[PDB]
């Protein structure tokens, strides 16, 4: 039993809700919140910009030190950093950005990072400003993630479409 509330159950391990991931994280304080990161951990917009803003830019400060030490992530890769005031940990995961020409096949590799954590609050990878089809992202999530994932979908219209089209 966990404290996630109001989710629709899609499969044995995947759950979904129309919610603002920032507000969800502040309420639940999950062990892991997933950020829709880029390889430079520049949290300018989308989910990343919103999560970083909610940390009063502390996420960005920590991320800049991480990059200065380690260099950029790989597309499809991840790193674990602090969750600040939102969660114990933030798993920064880089899905492919279609508006940069990146290979959508890397979306499966991106979701594989979730399997290193027993329970996660997450957005749909490569959705929103990353330019992928969110219906496809949900399909890859369900077919790749084996741990317990709670998906927050900000847009109500999109949430309803994802549920109604789910096979
Ligand atoms: O699938 C994501 C990528 O593009 C649009 C979607 N964005 C979001 N999803 C959940 N909570 C959110 N809070 C702020 C932005 C946001």
């Amino acid at each position: 039993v966990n404290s996630f509330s109001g989710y629709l159950k899609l499969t044995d391990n995947v759950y979904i809700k129309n919610a603002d991931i920032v507000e969800e994280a502040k309420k639940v304080k999950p062990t892991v919140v997933v950020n829709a990161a880029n390889v430079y951990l520049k949290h300018g917009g989308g989910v990343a910009g919103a999560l970083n803003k909610a940390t009063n830019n502390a996420m960005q400060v920590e991320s800049d030190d991480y990059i200065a030490t380690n260099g950029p992530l790989k597309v499809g890769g991840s790193c674990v950093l602090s969750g600040h005031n939102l969660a114990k940990h933030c798993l920064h995961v880089v899905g492919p950005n279609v508006n940069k020409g990146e290979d959508i096949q890397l979306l499966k590799s991106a979701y594989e990072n979730f399997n290193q954590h027993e329970v996660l609050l997450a957005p749909l990878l490569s959705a929103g400003i990353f330019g992928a089809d969110p219906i496809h992202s949900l399909r890859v999530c369900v077919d790749t993630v084996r741990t317990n994932v709670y998906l927050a979908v900000f847009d109500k219209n999109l949430y309803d479409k994802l549920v109604s089209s789910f096979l």
Side-chain angles (χ1 to χ4, degrees), residues 21 27 32 34 47 71 89 102 109 120 131 149 165:
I21 193 172
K27 184 73 174 183
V32 180
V34 173
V47 168
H89 305 287
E102 290 165 357
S109 301
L120 316 86
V149 57
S165 60

Side-chain angles (χ1 to χ4, degrees), residues 19-22 46-47 50 123-124 127-129 152-154:
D20 180 347
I21 193 172
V22 171
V47 168
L124 286 170
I129 68 177
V153 176
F154 180 59

Side-chain angles (χ1 to χ4, degrees), residues 46-111:
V47 168
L51 291 170
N52 177 56
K53 180 176 174 183
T55 76
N56 183 44
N57 211 50
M59 177 180 286
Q60 191 63 68
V61 172
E62 178 194 32
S63 293
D64 288 350
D65 170 84
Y66 173 92
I67 296 287
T69 297
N70 300 108
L73 296 181
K74 300 169 179 180
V75 179
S78 70
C79 68
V80 180
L81 291 172
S82 179
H84 301 276
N85 52 318
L86 304 177
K88 186 167 192 285
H89 305 287
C90 179
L91 181 69
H92 295 273
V93 180
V94 184
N97 188 327
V98 176
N99 305 318
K100 300 181 181 178
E102 290 165 357
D103 181 12
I104 193 64
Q105 308 303 308
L106 288 167
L107 187 55
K108 188 174 184 75
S109 301
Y111 274 117

